[PDB]
Amino acid sequence: MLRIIDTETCGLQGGIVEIASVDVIDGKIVNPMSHLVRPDRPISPQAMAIHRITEAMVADKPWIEDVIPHYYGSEWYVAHNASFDRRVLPEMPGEWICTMKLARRLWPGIKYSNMALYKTRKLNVQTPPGLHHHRALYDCYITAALLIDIMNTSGWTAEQMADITG
Amino acid sequence: MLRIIDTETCGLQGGIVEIASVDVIDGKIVNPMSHLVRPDRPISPQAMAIHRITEAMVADKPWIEDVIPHYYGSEWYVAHNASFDRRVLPEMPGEWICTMKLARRLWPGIKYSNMALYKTRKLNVQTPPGLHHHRALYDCYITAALLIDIMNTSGWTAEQMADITG
DNA sequence: GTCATTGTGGATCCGAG
DNA sequence: CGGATCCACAATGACCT
Ligand code: NA
Ligand code: NA
Ligand code: NA
Ligand code: NA
């Protein structure tokens, strides 16, 4: 089981306004989870233009510390550019896999943003209702679909993928 | 017809103690020739350990200029590291070909001494008894074998081989 | 001195919100 | 920011006796 994680933030230095995950088990996506989160700092307008989470949407929400333990319980955490989520999140109990590194290694010279990959790989995942690109749970479904594609294409195991991730 | 030339010397600066040649015609080695030569300087102990030619062996022999015209009569002069032989010999009336440059171009990262190439390429020619490796005529057979093998592998013409050489 | 191989500083572009 | 990826180069060595 691989747990795909995504985090929307106040900006590139961090502060968490949303987190979400799905699990990939036997080529299927299951066990969706998301929380809006009260950040440790103001949301920047540049970040707010991307994820469209306003201060009022998160004003009364739990802190990241309060919410992060619900995401414990996996050996493998997967993120698109996992470097980023690993930095901005509290320490996680597992090992990280980066689908960005994987994509670049599997298709040399491919464009390697999350949505560019999804578009070029012609993926089709059923996304959850009432969300959009750059809402955490939505992007989890994109990245999970990407990870499933990577695994079928390559035949890489969780271990090989962690090794490639470095 | 290509003429393989080898020289034994007093050391890396020159001084000629032996010269030898064979011709390669239609993939056959013919017309062996060799002269012991009186050098224009002392034979270094380092050189003597390689070729085993002594002062007493060369004391009454002709100078290199006396002997060198016997090796006229070819359009092509082949040597392994031809730069060396060209530097230490008087001027020759043809174009030079280096089997060492050719081998490195053909088989990069291979060890590229005369006898390493001969071994790695699994070559076998009739060699002349009475001599040993590092006598001039002996090493001529080794180099001629290498040349023939370079020619079959590569399909390069004499002119092309001379162009690669410089 | 040539040349395949090894190494490096630097410039540049990239992902993540 | 934390990385890749080229790129313009220098250094290494073998090679020849
Ligand atoms: Na993300
Ligand atoms: Na996202
Ligand atoms: Na020689
Ligand atoms: Na020799």
Q: How many CB atoms lie within 10 A of CB A77?
A: 22
Residue B143: helix, strand or coil by DSSP?
A: helix
Q: How far, in Å, is the centroid of ligand 2 from the Cα of B43? A: 78
**Nucleotide nearest the Cα atom of A13 (by C1'):** C17
Residues B67 and B34: their CA atoms lie apart, in Å, by: 10
Q: How far, in Å, is the centroid of ligand 3 from the Cα of B130? A: 19
> Any atom of strand D under 7 A from CB of B11?
yes
Residues A67 and B90: their CA atoms lie apart, in Å, by: 87
- Length reported for chain B: 166
CA angle A81, A86, A89 (to 5 degrees): 125
Nucleic acid strand C: bases within 7 A of protein CB:
1-5, 14-17
Residue the block writes with tokens 């003597």: B48
B64 contacts B33 by C-beta, under 8 angstroms: no
Q: How far, in Å, is the centroid of ligand 3 from the Cα of B65? A: 19
**Nucleotide nearest the Cα atom of B117 (by C1'):** D15
Cα B72 versus chain centre, distance: 15
Angle between helices A99-106 and A136-154 (to 10 degrees): 40
CA proximity to B99, closest of B153, B45, B48, B135: B153
H helices then E strands: how many in chain B? 8, 5
CB neighbour list of residue B152: distance below 8 Å, 6 or more residues apart: B27
- In the 8-state DSSP scheme, what is residue A26? T
Spanning CA of B49 to C1' of D9, the rounded length in angstroms is 39
CA proximity to B135, closest of B9, B3, B4: B9
Amino acid at position B93, single letter: P
Which string of b and e fits B134-163 if b means at least 16 CB within 10 Å? bbbbbbbbbbbbbbbbbbeeeebeeeebbe
Residue A9: helix, strand or coil by DSSP?
A: strand
Assigned CATH topology for domain A2-166:
Nucleotidyltransferase; domain 5 (3.30.420)
Strands A95-98 and B2-9: unpaired
**Chain B window 120-149, residues with Cβ within 7 A of nucleic strand D:** 134, 139
Structure method: X-ray
Spanning CA of B109 to C1' of C4, the rounded length in angstroms is 6
Residue the block writes with tokens 């090992």: A95
Nucleic acid strand D: bases within 7 A of protein CB:
2-6, 14-17
Cα B29 versus chain centre, distance: 13
A52 contacts A139 by C-beta, under 8 angstroms: no
- In the 8-state DSSP scheme, what is residue B75? S
Q: How far, in Å, is the centroid of ligand 2 from the Cα of A26? A: 24
CA angle B103, B107, B109 (to 5 degrees): 110
Resolution in A: 2.3
User: Token pair of A14, please?
Assistant: 């961090």
Spanning CA of A31 to C1' of C14, the rounded length in angstroms is 32
User: Token pair of B56, please?
Assistant: 């007493």
Q: How far, in Å, is the centroid of ligand 1 from the Cα of B46? A: 68
Strands B16-25 and B2-9: antiparallel
The backbone torsions φ and ψ at residue A109, rounded to the nearest 5 degrees and listed phi first, read 80, 5
Q: Dihedral sign, CA of B132, B134, B139, B140?
A: negative
> In what order do the strands lie in the sheet containing A95-98?
A28-36, A16-25, A2-9, A76-79, A95-98
Burial tier of A50 (Cβ tally within 10 Å: 0-12, 13-18, 19+) = middle
CA proximity to A88, closest of A9, A154, A160: A9
CA proximity to A27, closest of A138, A163, A154, A144: A144
CA distances A15 to A41, A43, A93, A97, A152, Å, are: 6, 8, 20, 22, 35
